[PDB]
Design a protein around this ligand. Structure first.
Ligand SMILES: Nc1ncnc2c1ncn2[C@@H]1O[C@H](COP(=O)(O)O)[C@@H](O)[C@H]1O
Ligand SMILES: [Zn+2]
Ligand SMILES: [Zn+2]
Length: 382
């Protein structure tokens, strides 16, 4: 029986958060194993695009989950709260690690990983669910603990675990806030209880472990919020998305007015025709991407007008979704276990490279992907 992988995502954990004395368990794990200086998200530095890149080794441009909210000619609208869109395999391109695992006779078990509610390439994990808000830390930790300990025919090669708590506190109060730090401490403590119980179960010693985050978090000070219609009025172009990566689709015959008012440099954003976007972002080829794409600057939000009023103007808040080469957008990568090096540090690298490492650790043939299989070989013990 080969060594299991445990894949843990802490949403919006910024890469410097391991070096503030608030992650004792993750810091111990890094000392015991392998730690990257940081891991750079793919564009857009949003939650669904980047979780799915992590498991596919593909840029959002290739895998089709190009934003959290999308429209498609055949499939219509997609967003995080339209359940039969998220559960529709047709949105999800490529092959995520759980599909590759089950296709080998082995079994994957997911706690709420993006894409895990759909039969991607007609393949569901053996364990999965419909994401619901407000689940307890110990509830999900103890469930994952269960699935690592199972045996016989219901033995899992892969187990995933997700935590929203850090991401949600960053939006609410910013990454330098005490709430964000408490969220980090809480998720770290929860992972320590998982790890301790895995030892008591005797699964820790045969399980490889990888902890990552999908991106980091920038502070969004008060007064750093504008209307999407300050960028382009409704009469000329439809704001497909808001937040930090704003997509416009010009009303029929308004391409020229939309472009004259939108394209180029503005106070706190810039905009591009999708095929002319900065090539380092490797983004803009997928048809599901709107015709015009605007990138807000670090620290700034553009919101649908109805939000912009009801946003109780007071608190420091936060956001991601900015340029993935920003230090503030940097995610975490660490790993530890029987097939991984010990006491090792790795240069900063890009999140597409994670796929090739997991595929080896999971004993699956690696699906075609955008990453470099050489990058994370040093992470392996031998
Ligand atoms: N599988 C899921 N289905 C629906 N919503 C999710 C899921 N996973 C996380 N979320 C929530 O959606 C948000 C992601 O948006 P963002 O972090 O702004 O890119 C997080 O703050 C989570 O609370
Ligand atoms: Zn996220
Ligand atoms: Zn977020």
């Amino acid at each position: 029986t080969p060594h299991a992988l445990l894949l843990i995502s802490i949403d919006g954990l910024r890469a410097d958060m391991l070096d503030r004395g608030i992650t004792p368990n993750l810091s111990h794990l890094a000392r015991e194993g392998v730690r990257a200086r940081w891991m750079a998200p793919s564009y857009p530095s949003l939650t669904f695009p980047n979780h799915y890149t992590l498991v596919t080794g593909l840029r959002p441009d290739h895998h089709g989950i190009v934003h959290n909210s999308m429209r498609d000619p055949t499939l219509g609208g997609f967003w995080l709260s339209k359940s039969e869109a998220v559960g529709d395999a047709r949105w999800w391109g490529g092959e995520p690690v759980w599909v590759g695992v089950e296709n080998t006779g082995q079994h994957a078990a997911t706690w709420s990983w993006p894409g895990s509610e759909a039969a991607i390439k007609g393949v569901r994990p053996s364990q999965w669910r419909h994401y619901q808000k407000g689940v307890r830390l110990d509830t999900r930790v103890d469930a994952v603990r269960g699935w690592l300990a199972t045996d016989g025919a219901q033995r899992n090669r892969l187990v995933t675990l997700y935590f929203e708590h850090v991401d949600e506190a960053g939006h609410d109060h910013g990454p330098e806030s005490r709430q964000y730090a408490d969220a980090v401490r809480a998720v770290d403590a929860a992972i320590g209880r998982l790890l301790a119980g895995m030892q008591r179960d005797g699964t820790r010693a045969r399980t490889n472990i990888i902890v990552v985050s999908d991106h980091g978090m920038a502070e969004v000070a008060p007064g750093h919020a504008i209307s999407v219609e300050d960028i382009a009025p409704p009469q000329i172009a439809t704001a497909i998305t808001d937040g930090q990566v704003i997509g416009f689709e010009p009303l029929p015959g308004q391409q020229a007015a939309a472009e004259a008012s939108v394209l180029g440099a503005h106070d706190h954003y810039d905009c591009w025709r999708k095929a002319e976007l900065p090539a380092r972002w490797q983004y803009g080829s997928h048809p599901r991407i709107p015709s015009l794409v605007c990138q807000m600057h670090e620290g700034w939000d553009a919101l649908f007008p109805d939000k912009l009023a009801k946003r109780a103007q007071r608190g420091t808040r936060g956001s991601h979704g900015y340029d993935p080469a920003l230090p503030s957008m940097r995610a975490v990568f660490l790993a530890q276990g029987p097939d991984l090096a010990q006491g090792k540090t790795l240069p900063g690298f890009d999140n597409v490279d994670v796929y090739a490492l997991m595929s080896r650790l999971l004993g699956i043939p690696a699906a075609p992907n955008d990453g470099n299989p050489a990058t994370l070989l040093p992470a392996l013990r031998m």
